[PDB]
């Protein structure tokens, strides 16, 4: 068994944030949406088991789990923060997941809405045959 294989997959992390025309009752000034997807509408569900968005502790039920696409959370709030995101893999071994500290930042009223894109590359060296075929469908 001489052959070996390295598989790369591209992920897109990003978010939009816009000032609400009318703030909410709680004083939330912004609507925002954060996401994890594949580039060019590719289908990362082939190898992604779930995506967990860990919202700031001020949010109710802050651990937001997306078992199915789209991997995204839509919320309202008043301030930006660091949002840890875990991508779990359809994997039986290491790595079972990868983590990113996503900067969910907001722009003040009077500036254009936020439309932010963060590309990440993932490398799997010699994945299992099953995982390899899942990765390569994406």
């Amino acid at each position: 068994m001489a052959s070996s294989c390295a598989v790369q997959v591209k992920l897109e992390l990003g978010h939009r944030a816009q000032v609400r025309k009318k703030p909410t009752v709680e004083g939330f000034t912004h609507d925002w949406m954060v996401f994890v997807r594949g580039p060019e509408h590719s289908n990362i569900q082939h190898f992604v088991e779930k995506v967990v968005f860990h919202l700031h502790e001020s949010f109710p039920r802050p651990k937001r789990v997306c078992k199915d696409p789209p991997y995204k959370v839509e919320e309202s709030g008043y301030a930006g923060f660091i949002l840890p995101i875990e991508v779990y893999f359809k994997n039986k071994e290491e790595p079972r997941k990868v983590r990113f500290d996503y900067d969910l930042f907001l722009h003040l009223e009077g500036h254009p809405p936020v439309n932010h894109l963060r590309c990440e590359k993932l490398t799997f060296n010699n994945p299992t045959e099953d995982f390899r075929r899942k990765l390569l469908k994406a």
Partner: peptide, 7 residues
């Protein structure tokens, strides 16, 4: 340019 932040 950013809003305030929480931590």
């Amino acid at each position: 340019k950013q809003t305030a932040r929480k931590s």
